[PDB]
Nucleic acid binder design. Structure first.
Lengths: 57, 57, 57, 57
DNA sequence: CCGTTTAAAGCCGTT
DNA sequence: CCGTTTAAAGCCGTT
DNA sequence: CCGTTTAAAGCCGTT
DNA sequence: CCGTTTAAAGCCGTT
DNA sequence: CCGTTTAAAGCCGTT
DNA sequence: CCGTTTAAAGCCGTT
DNA sequence: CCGTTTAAAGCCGTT
DNA sequence: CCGTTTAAAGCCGTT
């Protein structure tokens, strides 16, 4: 639902590597980010934890 | 280098799924995000493109 | 459906790094592999291609 | 080093989805698979475990 | 297939 | 408890 | 065609 | 917001 | 140009 | 292994 | 910033 | 021990 990334920051970085960002690239990256977090929450739970660690991503 | 994600938004979502976020979780997620983008830029280039599309992620 | 990985080869490698493999680890890795390929096929198609390249993974 | 996937099985599946496999696609998929396992071994260790579980992938 | 044994899970008081 | 792996069982042609 | 970005428009307190 | 312009898409004959 | 796949070549015991 | 053929790459004018 | 408190880590005997 | 979050402190224009 909510945007979790800083579009301007992402475009800044992509530009710095000699590339451009499509109108719908950020929405797509945001979908991948949710998938990462949802994957991480399943790893947290399978380790009997309530606290997500960097290693769970 | 730069933070690309909204820590507060990430913690909000993780909380809503009945979990907590570690002090260093967001920095870890930020590393994964860079890896996603760096992977995507290699896909853009291998398709002879300068414009990153959502599909490249 | 079909197993795409060499269980014995995977266990060999995991052992060589000083770790063991759970009874259901390989089935789980096989699920991740399918997800990688299904992701790659969507990248192939979005580039108007029928031939999957290493870069699509 | 070692091939961990069944090239013929992978090509079989990719064919069944209406696509072809490049000469160097399988080597590329094999690299991604190693990256998955190396990622999984770091998750195993950070949970103070020696036994890789499906959830670690 | 099975025995050996290493490793994970369980319990509880501490951080 | 469970994964690893050594060892036993099975099959068949020889002694 | 489309993404980037420069430039114009909008708002308000000053000249 | 909009103009500029770079880049992607389209078409077709070759590899 | 390249990937797919059909077809030819190789090996050996039979006719 | 090799022939067939589908698909990707190349070129250029348009969007 | 800080206090509250939930959760993770530690220890050891069991599976 | 640590993450969450409530509460206190800081800044400034008013009473």
């Amino acid at each position: 639902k909510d945007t979790l990334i800083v579009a301007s920051k992402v475009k800044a970085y992509i530009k710095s590597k000699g590339f451009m960002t499509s109108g719908d690239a950020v929405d797509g990256l945001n979908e991948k980010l949710y998938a990462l977090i949802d994957d991480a929450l399943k790893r947290t739970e399978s380790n009997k934890r309530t606290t997500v660690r960097p290693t769970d991503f």
